[PDB]
Amino acid sequence: DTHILVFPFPSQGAINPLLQLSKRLIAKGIKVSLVTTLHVSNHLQLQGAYSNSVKIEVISDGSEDRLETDTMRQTLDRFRQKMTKNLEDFLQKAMVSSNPPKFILYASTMPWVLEVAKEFGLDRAPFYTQSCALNSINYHVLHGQLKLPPETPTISLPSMPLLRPSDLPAYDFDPASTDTIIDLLTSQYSNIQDANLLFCNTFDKLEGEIIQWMETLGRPVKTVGPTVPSAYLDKRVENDKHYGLSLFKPNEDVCLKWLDSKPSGSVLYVSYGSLVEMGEEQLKELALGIKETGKFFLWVVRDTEAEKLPPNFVESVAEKGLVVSWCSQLEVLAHPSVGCFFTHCGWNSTLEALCLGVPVVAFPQWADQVTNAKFLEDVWKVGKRVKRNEQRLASKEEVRSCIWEVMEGERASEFKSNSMEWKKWAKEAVDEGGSSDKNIEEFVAMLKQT
Ligand SMILES: CC(=O)N[C@H]1[C@@H](OP(=O)(O)OP(=O)(O)OC[C@H]2O[C@@H](n3ccc(=O)[nH]c3=O)[C@H](O)[C@@H]2O)O[C@H](CO)[C@@H](O)[C@@H]1O
Numbered sequence: 001d002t003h004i005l006v007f008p009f010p011s012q013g014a015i016n017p018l019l020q021l022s023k024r025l026i027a028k029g030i031k032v033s034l035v036t037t038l039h040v041s042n043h044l045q046l047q048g049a050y051s052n053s054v055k056i057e058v059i060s061d062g063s064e065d066r067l068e069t070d071t072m073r074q075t076l077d078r079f080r081q082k083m084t085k086n087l088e089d090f091l092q093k094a095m096v097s098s099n100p101p102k103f104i105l106y107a108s109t110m111p112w113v114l115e116v117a118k119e120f121g122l123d124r125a126p127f128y129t130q131s132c133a134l135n136s137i138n139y140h141v142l143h144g145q146l147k148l149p150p151e152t153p154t155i156s157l158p159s160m161p162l163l164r165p166s167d168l169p170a171y172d173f174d175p176a177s178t179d180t181i182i183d184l185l186t187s188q189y190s191n192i193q194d195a196n197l198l199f200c201n202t203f204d205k206l207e208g209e210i211i212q213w214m215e216t217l218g219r220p221v222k223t224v225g226p227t228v229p230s231a232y233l234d235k236r237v238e239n240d241k242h243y244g245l246s247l248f249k250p251n252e253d254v255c256l257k258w259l260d261s262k263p264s265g266s267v268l269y270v271s272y273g274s275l276v277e278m279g280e281e282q283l284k285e286l287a288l289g290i291k292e293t294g295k296f297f298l299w300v301v302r303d304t305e306a307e308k309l310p311p312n313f314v315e316s317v318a319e320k321g322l323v324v325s326w327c328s329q330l331e332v333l334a335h336p337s338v339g340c341f342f343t344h345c346g347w348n349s350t351l352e353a354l355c356l357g358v359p360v361v362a363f364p365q366w367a368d369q370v371t372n373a374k375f376l377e378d379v380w381k382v383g384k385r386v387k388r389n390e391q392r393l394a395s396k397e398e399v400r401s402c403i404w405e406v407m408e409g410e411r412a413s414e415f416k417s418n419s420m421e422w423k424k425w426a427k428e429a430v431d432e433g434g435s436s437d438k439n440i441e442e443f444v445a446m447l448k449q450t
Contacts, residue, residue, distance in 0.1 A: 002447045003099045005057075007035040007087075007106040007113060008127075012043060013275065014107065016243040016348065017129040017201050019054075020227035021105075021440075023245070024430075026052050027237050028444045033101065034245075035090065037083075038062040045246040054245050057094075059086040072177035076184065080112050087116050095120055102450050105199065108188040118194055125197040125222075126188065130347045132200050132207040132223075133375060134368050135189070135214055136160050137168065142186035148178070159213035167374040173366045192219055197443070201225040201347070203429035203436050206354070206380070206422070222439040226351040226426050232330055233355055234431035241330070255298060255327035256335060262296050265339030265416075268403060269332050269358070270299035273344040276365050277305065282393060284310045286363075289399025290342070291317055295407065297342075298332060299323045333358050339416075340383075340407045345372040357423030359383045359415040361402050363394065382419045384411075 006022050008015040015036075022032045034046060037060040046056045064082035066075040094101055101122065106113040108126040117124035128135055136157055140146040146155065150165040157163070171181045192198060202225045204211060215221045230237035242248040259267060270290060272278055278286070287310055290297050297317075301309075303325055314323050329349070332338055333356040342361040343349045350372045353360050360383035362373035377385045386394045386402045406415055429436040 001031045001099055002029070002444075003031040003033065003101050004103040004105060004447060005033050005035050005094070005101045006054075007104060007110065009107040009109045010037040010040045010060075012040075014109070014129065015040065015044070017225075017227040018105065018107070018127055019245055020229065020243060021127070021199075021224055022054050023230075023237060023240060024224070024440055025444065026054065028440065030444060030447060031055070031099070033057050033094075035059055035087070035104075037064065039065060045244065048245050049247070057090065059083075059090040072174075072180040076180065080110075083110070084112055084116060087113065088119075091116065091120050091122065095122070102447055103196070109184060111187050111191055114191050114194055123196045125195050125199055126192070127199040127201070128188070129201045129227075130368050131350075131372060131375070132202050132210040132214060133160065133371055134169065135200070136210055137163075137371065138185045139189045139217070141182065142189050148172075148182055159209040161374070161379050163371075163374065167370055169368050170366050170370055189217075192217060195219050197222050199224055201227050201351075203426060203434075205425040205429065205435070222443060223429075224436050224439050224443075226355050226430065226436075228351055228355045228426075229330065230430070232334055232352075233427050234434075234437075236431065250328070251326070253328060253331070254324060255300075255322070255332055258322050259298065259332065259335045259337040262337040264336045266296055267337050268293070268295050268297040268340045268342055268361070268407070269329075269338045270297055270301075270342040271329065271344070271349070272301070272342075272363060273346055273349070273365065273369075274302065276344055278308070278365075280308045283308050284313075285394060285396045286399055287313045289394075289396040290321070290403065292396060292400040293403045293407075294320065295403065296337075297321045298327065298338075300327050300329070300332075301325070330356070340403070342403070345369040345376060347372055350376060351426075354380070354382070354419075354422045355426045357419045359406055359412075359419045361386065361406050380418065380422060381411075382415055382422060 006018045008018040026032055033055040035057050038058055041058045064079050103123040104117050105125050105127055108128045114124055140157055155163040172178045198219050198221045200223050202223050204223055211221055211223055230240040333352055341353050341358045345362050345364045360376050362376050362385040364370045364373040373385050376383050383406050384402050387398045388394045428434045
């Protein structure tokens with residue numbers, strides 16, 4: 001049996017991509033052990049009931065958890081120190097077992113794992129879960145060719161589209177941690193000389209030239225994305241309709257029946273992000289702008305954010321809008337009545353829109369969302385970004401006009417045609433013989449040779 005370890009960043013918001021990749025690997029005959037923390041094992045249902053199910057290895061005792069008194073630097077230092085010892089202790093045992101691991105695939109945000117693997121003589125590779133465009137930006141910040149505030153009005157990197165400073169990732173949302181955040185991201189490219197491979201959560205037709213640029217750094221690059229459940233793509237992995245490893249228990253849904261009565265391609269699905277907080281002022285303009293379009297809309301917004309909606313808003317859109325606390329985003333985007341997706345452009349949501357063929361109204365808020373939005377509008381051409389003013393407020397007029405332009409304007413047919421092409425190309429990449437399937441097959445072949 002060929003056995004490997006997968007070690008994602010141990011957070012709910014960061015583990016889905018390699019859980020999905022793990023499922024593609026076990027479908028090809030690889031035995032996978034998920035290395036993780038007590039916290040993740042307690043909050044997620046990771047155990048499958050089958051012979052080839054991902055094996056869960058909890059290697060921590062919770063002492064690596066953040067304390068309320070920490071600066072981000074202190075939390076990161078304690079995590080690295082304790083998890084370095086935890087991984088060393090785990091490999092001490094695993095490397096002398098009956099079927100020792102032959103490789104460790106780890107999140108790119110834990111670059112310290114490479115030095116542990118190096119000491120043990122264990123093959124290893126980081127997984128970059130975000131876009132390949134972010135790899136180029138972060139690499140250029142590490143090597144001095146770019147700065148956190150761009151020193152120039154325009155940015156022309158190699159094999160990339162032109163970027164304005166507003167298109168660059170915004171991580172100054174927490175000004176005391178900005179320096180720590182940039183050091184961690186730039187540290188993901190520092191030790192790649194010793195990586196067996198570099199894995200990226202993207203596909204060749206989506207970021208081909210950037211991937212080719214990344215291949216000039218000296219190491220083989222394997223695109224294995226999009227990491228979206230097989231049911232919404234190639235359908236080659238039996239009932240894989242969710243991101244997790246345990247059996248899928250669907251929630252009671254009020255969204256699909258409502259969508260069933262609406263005309264095909266007519267409704268705007270709205271989500272500004274499951275963990276994004278929006279100010280009352282901005283939420284009011286967003287709400288009224290959607291209302292002014294007169295379109296049917298399905299807005300998913302969590303209970304603590306829903307309390308910030310204007311009074312009488314929900315009652316005022318009783319006819320055209322369904323505002324709910326939760327829906328299955330994949331099932332909503334796959335529904336034929338959904339014709340546009342108002343999104344914050346998180347990388348997960350970006351790939352879901354591309355895989356499901358839905359045009360977008362882009363409303364990025366922080367981090368890599370701004371760069372993803374730039375690509376959705378200006379490179380992939382599946383939608384438009386909401387214009388904000390000199391105070392960064394997107395007005396209700398700016399929200400309404402953007403929605404109308406994507407769904408009804410001169411380029412509306414272009415966006416739908418482009419969305420349909422990307423859906424076809426994303427499915428092709430992960431289906432048999434595709435660019436991502438080939439890379440996965442190549443990895444599995446390499447593992448079979450040890
Ligand atoms: C790529 C990534 O790591 N996350 C992105 C984003 O979220 P991301 O793009 O992951 O967006 P969400 O947090 O909204 O979604 C998380 C997951 O929950 C699902 N979902 C969400 C809401 C809902 O009602 N139902 C549902 O099923 C989505 O399909 C997705 O798979 O997180 C940050 C937002 O602060 C971004 O900076 C990240 O780039």
